[PDB]
Design a protein around this nucleic acid. Structure first.
Lengths: 149, 44, 129, 141
RNA sequence: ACGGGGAAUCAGGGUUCGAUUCCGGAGAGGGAGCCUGAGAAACGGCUACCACAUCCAAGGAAGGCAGCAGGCGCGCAAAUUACCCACUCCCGACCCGGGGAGGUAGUGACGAAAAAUAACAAUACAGGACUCUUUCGAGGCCCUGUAAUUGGAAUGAGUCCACUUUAAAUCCUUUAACGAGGAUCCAUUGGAGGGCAAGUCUGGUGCCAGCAGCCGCGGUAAUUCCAGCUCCAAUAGCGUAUAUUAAAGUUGCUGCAGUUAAAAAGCUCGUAGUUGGAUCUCUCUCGGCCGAAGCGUUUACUUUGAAAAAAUUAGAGUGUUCAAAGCAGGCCGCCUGGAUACCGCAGCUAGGAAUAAUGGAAUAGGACCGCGGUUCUAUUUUGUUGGUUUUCGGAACUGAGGCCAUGAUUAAGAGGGACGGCCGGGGGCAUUCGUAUUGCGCCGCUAGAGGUGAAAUUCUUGGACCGGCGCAAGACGGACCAGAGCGAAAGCAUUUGCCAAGAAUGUUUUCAUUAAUCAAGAACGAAAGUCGGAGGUUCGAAGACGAUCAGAUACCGUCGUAGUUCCGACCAUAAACGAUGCCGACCGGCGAUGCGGCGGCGUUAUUCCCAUGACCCGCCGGGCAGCUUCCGGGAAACCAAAGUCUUUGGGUUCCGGGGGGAGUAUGGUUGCAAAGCUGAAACUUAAAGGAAUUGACGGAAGGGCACCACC
RNA sequence: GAAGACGGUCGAACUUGACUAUCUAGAGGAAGUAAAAGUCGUAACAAGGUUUCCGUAGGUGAACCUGCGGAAGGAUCAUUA
């Protein structure tokens, strides 16, 4: 059941049992990594690079071809962002709710909807401070967030 | 009563109250000044 | 959320002996489920079962005999010294003749009659009769 | 449902000792406010001095006059209406007499017919009422 | 509240008591200060002060029972101003003296153990039973007694010489002598309606006296009071009062409840707490192959060990005359015993390695190897002796190279975040339309119009209502509108645009446990109401009138302030309801419905084709619901959850404990206030209450009938 | 080597303030309690003669009444293209 919603919805991806790279795929792991470096130099997230190779280049799982997954390729080449992918998209979303909120003060919908985006940020910042992906003094302050994204 | 010392005090006043009232009539009889200690004796 | 996978996999096979079925599906399986199920099978309560291996966490299909009255879990797994096993098997079992308490000792997941021989305490996992 | 962890004994032990307070049998014996309100102070019996013989009326569906006695207790000065039990047992009592009083039997509640009377006379003038009623002894003056 | 050892109760879990004879603490009327001494802040030592108080010749002197006795006072509540160092032990110069320590008696129904108040025989029964007689009735064959029938045989309780006991006595044990027939050498305390064993027998009283824990009894026939008889229960004991334990699964860990009986917070976020998905099969330097020393990441768990005062508790042995006890005893000088278990948590120890927490390398300043450098430096080496320099030894730090099968568990029918096409009376801002109502302008024809069960208050030629054209003002968005949709809940419907959110679905994307529930703390919160402005169309608390009425200060009708509308603050409550906490799994059918995806005959439109829409037939996922059913529950009504519950344990929050007093009083806190939150007790009651049944009643309906009904 | 003094320290206690707490004499009135079978309506239970109940504001002889907004624990589980 979804965290800050009353919906108990079931929709996801179903990975197959056969874990091997299939027969027709004529891309080696070095060629896939070379594709990933260009698609990251274009300025895409790890969640967007895995889509482009699936749709156009026919790569089902990059973890199945290369042996490593997407983020551990970019963080080993060096072309990786400091704050992670999902924490960025929450901080960037809480900016646009907060930016729109100074225009319309009476909107008590997005005033409630800001706290849910707020309370998801501290759930992730706690996790990243625990796993030491973030420095242990990083805090979300509501005024500096226009220069974090 | 309130708090163990104003209960021990409260007992001491009422102990002193009773213990002094029982003495205000004890000297009614047979002191050194001595209205004599009248003892009537009868056999049954 | 699913706290206690052994709890949901025993009330899945409790609720189907009621309804008269001959097979259960119990997903997901841990290996505490397979040890517990093997103790019930060795005392004739269950019969043969098959572990379906998807790459995630297995499911089990268990063929049922009609011999199990009750299958239960104790939560939390209290610690049971061997001098305190009689109170447990008097609160949980229907008689002195049948029924078993499963506890996880350091010599393996076993009965209460096995744990008395090998002279071992453990933590109580559950019971069946 | 109840909490059921293995480290939850402080939640368990302290929920009970707050929930114990809603038990009126628990509270009336642990709060202390009903033992300073008790006229005896937690004694089985007490002595007193008869002020007058007030006789009080029975309750609703049955009619008589219960003969009682207004007692003023020695050890704390409190006043008490106690019930003189058998028949012809008010006729062993005069005023200003010293009376050992008991409870009635319901531990500080009234006993059915009599309204608001929680005590009964046991001995008058240091002789027993069962000794006077059954004629075993004589009333001492 | 001195703490423990322990005590009561108890299926298992528990609960309550522990002043009290053993261990430890403290204190000698209340605080304080000392002397002496190995040891005291000592009180059967001293010095003060505060409190009491004794003598006195008035100048002075002496005090400390919570030692043993004893007294007063207090109280429901507790023994002798007795004898002795003989026992157990202690002190002293000590085999010798002393000890209210202690022992022995006295008082003692605290309490616990044993245990009398009669046994037997012969007769007789208008007693029973066994063998025969069809039955009358025949018998020492066995039993019984409302036989105060007879009869001896037995014995203590007492009375009492003697011994024994003891320090001396008592008591018990042992023995003389006396000692039982209504064996008057009399057994009592509560009861006889039900709970609950046992009399609707007789007399008295007549809702009186009184009984009765509770229900109830008593108003002239009382099964219940006052008594007589008879019967019952325990029995040298039995009632009563109060504390407490069980009964109480009515405090619930085991093990309760929360739709309607008492009770789920209005909704949501959230820190602490509590709980958390799969996954991984002992070796180096020495001593005689066997011991040291190290571990390995740290623990929880479990098993063993050793340490845990005695007494108590459990339990072994033992004929105290039995027993409660005791630690004694037994054999014809000897032979014995004085065991043992239990002794939570915490701390030591050793084995196990399942479960549960935790580490171990991911910008490799990573493991194992041998290679080189820099700094310090061991102490043996040169027959001893002073000086130099190596080697090695042991550390500490850097640079290459080899080698690692070199090092990332999966991707949860857990969760977050991308992305995709949709969807919705979700939210905010701007804009737009609609008829109506009220008011106004003008025209028309005219005396009525409004409202009611009836009227009346009210507007009318200072022309009402009605038909027509316009103008404005503010309010509200029908029918379409559904047991449909969205929203965290309150809540949300005209057009159009803008702005920022969201669910569900689809996915061979991504991160990889990030989660569930939640003190504290926080956001939103219908209606009403309070401070400030703006506007006032309808409606309208309060108020004024008219009517109905025995009476109306209400229902009904006409006016009508605050309000109802807009914005800035507050308020934080509702029958805020599904009267139903959230997360998770399993458990029957059926047909519809909304949104998204997938497959499929065949009809319409975009002219024919593709694609899309509209249908039609299915399938999948998630939603609001419905019908149904011997799934199972429930006191039922009923509920597919209110199921999976004595076959009781998936996680977790709140919260109830007979009815009243009372959501009151007080205290704190919040508020402009209104009020909100938190929240008693004294006393008072034996029922209050939930579902369902059968009547009865209805100024509730449907139907039906009668000249004791009408027409 | 006694009396006695200076100074230090320990500290009982005394005096007066403040905060209290408790024992004690006094008109006035205050609230609940023991009953009450005393008088006027009949709010409620039937559609209880204005369905009832909930919150919230206002007014009274009072049970209450009325304005707003809910709920059915209602007197409808339903009203026709």
């Amino acid at each position: 059941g979804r965290m800050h919603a009353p919906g108990k919805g079931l929709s996801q991806s179903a990975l197959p049992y056969r874990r091997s790279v299939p027969t027709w795929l004529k891309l080696t792991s070095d060629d896939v990594k070379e594709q990933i470096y260009k698609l990251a130099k274009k300025g895409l997230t790890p969640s967007q690079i895995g889509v482009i190779l699936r749709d156009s280049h026919g790569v089902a799982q990059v973890r199945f071809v290369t042996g490593n997954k997407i983020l551990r390729i970019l963080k080993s080449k060096g072309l990786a962002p400091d704050l992670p992918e999902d924490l960025y998209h929450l901080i960037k979303k809480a900016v646009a709710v907060r930016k729109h909120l100074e225009r319309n003060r009476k909107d008590k919908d997005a005033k409630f909807r800001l706290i849910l985006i707020e309370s998801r940020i501290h759930r992730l910042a706690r996790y990243y401070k625990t796993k030491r992906v973030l420095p242990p003094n990083w805090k979300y302050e509501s005024s500096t967030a226009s220069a974090l994204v | 009563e309130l708090s163990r010392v104003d209960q021990r005090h409260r007992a001491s006043q009422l102990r002193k109250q009773k213990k002094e009232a029982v003495l205000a009539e004890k000297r009614q009889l047979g002191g050194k000044d001595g209205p004599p200690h009248q003892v009537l004796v009868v056999p049954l | 959320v699913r706290m206690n996978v052994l709890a949901d996999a025993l009330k899945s096979i409790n609720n189907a002996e009621k309804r008269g079925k001959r097979q259960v599906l119990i997903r997901p399986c841990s290996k505490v489920i397979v040890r517990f199920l093997t103790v019930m099978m060795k005392h004739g309560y269950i019969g043969e079962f098959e572990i379906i291996d998807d790459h995630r966490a297995g499911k089990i299909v268990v063929n049922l005999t009609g011999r199990l009255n009750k299958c239960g879990v104790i939560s939390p797994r209290f610690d049971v010294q061997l001098k305190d096993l009689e109170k447990w098997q008097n609160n949980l079992l229907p008689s002195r003749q049948f029924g078993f308490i499963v506890l996880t000792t350091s010599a393996g997941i076993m009965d209460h009659e096995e744990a008395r021989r090998k002279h071992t305490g453990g933590k109580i996992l559950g019971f069946f009769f | 449902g109840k909490c059921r962890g293995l480290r939850t004994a402080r939640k368990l032990r302290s929920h009970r000792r707050d929930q114990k307070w809603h038990d009126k049998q628990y509270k009336k014996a642990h709060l202390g406010t009903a033992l300073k309100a008790n006229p005896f102070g937690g004694a089985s019996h007490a002595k007193g001095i008869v002020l007058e013989k007030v006789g009080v009326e029975a309750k609703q569906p049955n009619s008589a006059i219960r003969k009682c006695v207004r007692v003023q207790l020695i050890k704390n000065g409190k006043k008490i209406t106690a019930f003189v039990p058998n028949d012809g047992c008010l006729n062993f009592i005069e005023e200003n007499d010293e009376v050992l009083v008991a409870g009635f039997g319901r531990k500080g509640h009234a006993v059915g017919d009599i309204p608001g009377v929680r005590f009964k006379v046991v001995k008058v003038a240091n002789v027993s009422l069962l000794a006077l009623y059954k004629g075993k002894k004589e009333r001492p003056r």
